[PDB]
Amino acid sequence: TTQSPLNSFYATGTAQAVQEPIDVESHLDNTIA
Amino acid sequence: TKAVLSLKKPSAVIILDNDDYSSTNKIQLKVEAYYEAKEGMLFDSLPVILNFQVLSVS
Amino acid sequence: PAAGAQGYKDMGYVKIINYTDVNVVKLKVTLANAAQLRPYFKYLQLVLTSNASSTVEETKAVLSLKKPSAVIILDNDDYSSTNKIQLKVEAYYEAKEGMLFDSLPVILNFQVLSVS
Amino acid sequence: TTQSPLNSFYATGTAQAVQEPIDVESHLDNTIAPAAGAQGYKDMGYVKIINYTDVNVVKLKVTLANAAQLRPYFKYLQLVLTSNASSTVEETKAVLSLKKPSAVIILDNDDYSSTNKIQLKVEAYYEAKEGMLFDSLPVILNFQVLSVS
Ligand SMILES: *[C@@H]1O[C@H](CO)[C@@H](O)[C@H](O)[C@H]1NC(C)=O
Numbered sequence: 001t002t003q004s005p006l007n008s009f010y011a012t013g014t015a016q017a018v019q020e021p022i023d024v025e026s027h028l029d030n031t032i033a
Numbered sequence: 034t035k036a037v038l039s040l041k042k043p044s045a046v047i048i049l050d051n052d053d054y055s056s057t058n059k060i061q062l063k064v065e066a067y068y069e070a071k072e073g074m075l076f077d078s079l080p081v082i083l084n085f086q087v088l089s090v091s
Numbered sequence: 092p093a094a095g096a097q098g099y100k101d102m103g104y105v106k107i108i109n110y111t112d113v114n115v116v117k118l119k120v121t122l123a124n125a126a127q128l129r130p131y132f133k134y135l136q137l138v139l140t141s142n143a144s145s146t147v148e149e150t151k152a153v154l155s156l157k158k159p160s161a162v163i164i165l166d167n168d169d170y171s172s173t174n175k176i177q178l179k180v181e182a183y184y185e186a187k188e189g190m191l192f193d194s195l196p197v198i199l200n201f202q203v204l205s206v207s
Numbered sequence: 208t209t210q211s212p213l214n215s216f217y218a219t220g221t222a223q224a225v226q227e228p229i230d231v232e233s234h235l236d237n238t239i240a241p242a243a244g245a246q247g248y249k250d251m252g253y254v255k256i257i258n259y260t261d262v263n264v265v266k267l268k269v270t271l272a273n274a275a276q277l278r279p280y281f282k283y284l285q286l287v288l289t290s291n292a293s294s295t296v297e298e299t300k301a302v303l304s305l306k307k308p309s310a311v312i313i314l315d316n317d318d319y320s321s322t323n324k325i326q327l328k329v330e331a332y333y334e335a336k337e338g339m340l341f342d343s344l345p346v347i348l349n350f351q352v353l354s355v356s
Pocket residue numbers: 109110111112113114115166167170173174
């Protein structure tokens with residue numbers, strides 16, 4: 001004679017974010033002379 | 034489509050009937066997600082958990 | 092993990108043995124030393140899944156430092172090989188910033204509420 | 208006739224953390240050696256950063272420790288730091304000076320090439336004081352970790 005609560009069910013996922021939106025690189029190779 | 038869950042209204046109630054029980058023994062439900070991430074927040078290994086509870090069976 | 096890192100780890104499994112004229116067991120699982128572990132962690136979550144039946148894998152409870160106790164049900168489907176339950180533990184954690192330590196135990200307790 | 212409480216069951220695990228998130232090694236082996244009062248252009252070297260278990264993103268603060276000592280010897284002095292460890296992504300992260308000695312930089316998944324180290328060279332621009340002669344003067348940089356994940 002056991003009474004159960006009937007709520008022992010689960011499901012699991014994951015998420016992440018490990019980088020910045022943009023990357024910037026420079027090529028200014030001229031001199032104001 | 035049976036229910037839509039969100040961070041403001043996390044709970045919903047659905048009904049499964051004779052039409053859903055194909056192969057007479059199982060239900061298949063996929064999950065669809067829409068999201069927008071916070072600005073400038075970096076993280077990893079964060080779990081998302083869903084719970085099920087039976088209210089009535091017949 | 093390293094100090095202040097966010098991680099993902101598994102621990103092991105626990106065996107349960109059931110005896111004569113027993114069919115259904117109701118159990119309560121809690122974290123015995125949650126108070127001691129508070130200064131060392133921002134958060135720590137444990138996931139318990141029943142696997143002993145190769146056809147039915149089920150997660151039964153999730154434990155945390157804020158809600159350390161849970162109640163689970165084991166029934167005819169779980170008792171594969173008719174004599175034992177296998178439950179592995181899944182851990183998610185984030186360590187405190189700049190805290191160093193070693194040889195710290197984690198303790199779990201079991202109590203029977205009803206058997207039939 | 209014995210009554211049992213039915214709670215004599217236990218299971219035990221362990222945990223530990225015995226190292227700091229990062230390790231830093233220096234290879235600054237060049238000398239700023241101009242004439243007195245000259246305006247110049249020089250490079251210095253590079254610095255290595257090592258990242259350890261379960262570390263993905265590091266937030267750092269870099270400052271000039273002995274800026275006050277260097278003031279009487281220079282009219283201005285600027286340091287340029289660039290991340291290069293990824294052969295595809297070269298990025299300048301911060302510029303340090305005697306008036307604004309501190310800066311905050313971010314290192315992410317793209318920077319961690321070879322999965323284990325960061326390479327940062329130092330670029331210097333300077334103008335020496337007029338008629339000042341000296342030798343054996345050190346330049347010191349300091350690192351502090353603000354957050355790791
Ligand atoms: C343990 O429970 C199972 C499943 O209900 C049952 O078949 C088995 O007989 C029980 N074991 C013993 C030793 O009675």
